[PDB]
């Protein structure tokens, strides 16, 4: 007998950061925006893939724009699949389609991204079909285009690997 009603409808536009005074966009499209863990923050990431530049910045509850990293990758056409931040050790995890997992490092007191380091931890060849994190940010499962699924730990160590096969079929009909 209950009904559903709408309370609020909020919106805004993530403003790309450039040195220019007018500071308009550079065709930067947002790839991912997340719900930060109840810390009155919304971490968004935008970029231009053709030239190969990405930018991650936090939108505060009041509306203060703060940038922690803005870096350009040498390659291009590299679409994202999952970006997260631990918010306890203060790192950043990016998953790319080519095979590179990007680990970014930032400081809280450094308002500018001048001290954000990058790590290009081990690549997965032949691209990656998809990847996903768990709810607790502990298990990293992903699948390669060659029907091989690999599960990695939270510290980028291999939990296991397994070759998915069409010949594997746990049928629901055995005649015993």
């Amino acid at each position: 007998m209950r009904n559903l009603i709408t309370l609020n409808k909020g919106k805004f536009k993530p403003t790309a950061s450039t040195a220019e005074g007018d500071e308009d966009d550079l065709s930067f499209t947002l790839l991912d925006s997340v719900f930060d863990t109840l810390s009155d923050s919304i971490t968004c990431v935008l970029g231009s893939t053709d030239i190969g530049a990405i930018e991650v910045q936090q939108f505060m509850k009041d509306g203060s724009r703060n940038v922690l990293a803005s870096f350009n990758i040498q390659t291009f056409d590299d679409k994202l699949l999952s970006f997260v931040h631990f918010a306890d050790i203060n790192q950043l995890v990016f998953v790319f389609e080519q095979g590179d997992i990007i680990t970014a490092t930032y400081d809280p007191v450094s308002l500018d991204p001048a001290e954000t380091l990058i790590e290009i931890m081990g690549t997965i060849d032949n691209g990656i079909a998809a990847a996903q994190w768990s709810y607790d940010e502990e298990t990293l499962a992903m699948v390669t285009k060659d029907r091989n699924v690999v599960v990695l730990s939270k510290l980028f160590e291999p939990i296991s690997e397994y070759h998915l096969e069409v010949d594997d079929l746990k049928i629901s009909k055995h005649v015993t």
Binding site: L4, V151, K170, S172
Partner: protein, 96 residues
């Protein structure tokens, strides 16, 4: 640890819509039935963890849609169906 447990039961028209009910009961997927008669429609199908079919309910949409993703609420109340223009919310009481 990366072992195998079970493989699904083959069904016709199963698209790439995959999502798990947080309570831990039913997998949600989208099916299109274009066979003869008036049964043809667009349905949502639930799959048990043993890869066995269970339960179904049809959306009243026209047979020409294209649904992107299906989202389970953080709890077991709201099901979000995502389209190009409209976004729909479904909930069940008394299995209806």
């Amino acid at each position: 640890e990366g072992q195998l447990d079970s493989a699904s039961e083959p069904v016709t028209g199963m698209e790439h819509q995959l999502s798990w009910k947080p309570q831990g009961s039913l997998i949600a997927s989208i099916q299109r039935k274009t066979d003869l008669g008036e049964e043809d429609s667009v349905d949502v199908i639930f799959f048990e963890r043993n890869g066995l079919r269970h339960g179904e309910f049809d959306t009243r949409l026209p047979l020409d849609e294209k649904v992107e993703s299906v989202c389970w609420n953080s709890n077991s109340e709201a099901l979000a169906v995502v389209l190009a223009n409209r976004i729909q919310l479904w909930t069940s009481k008394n299995y209806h």
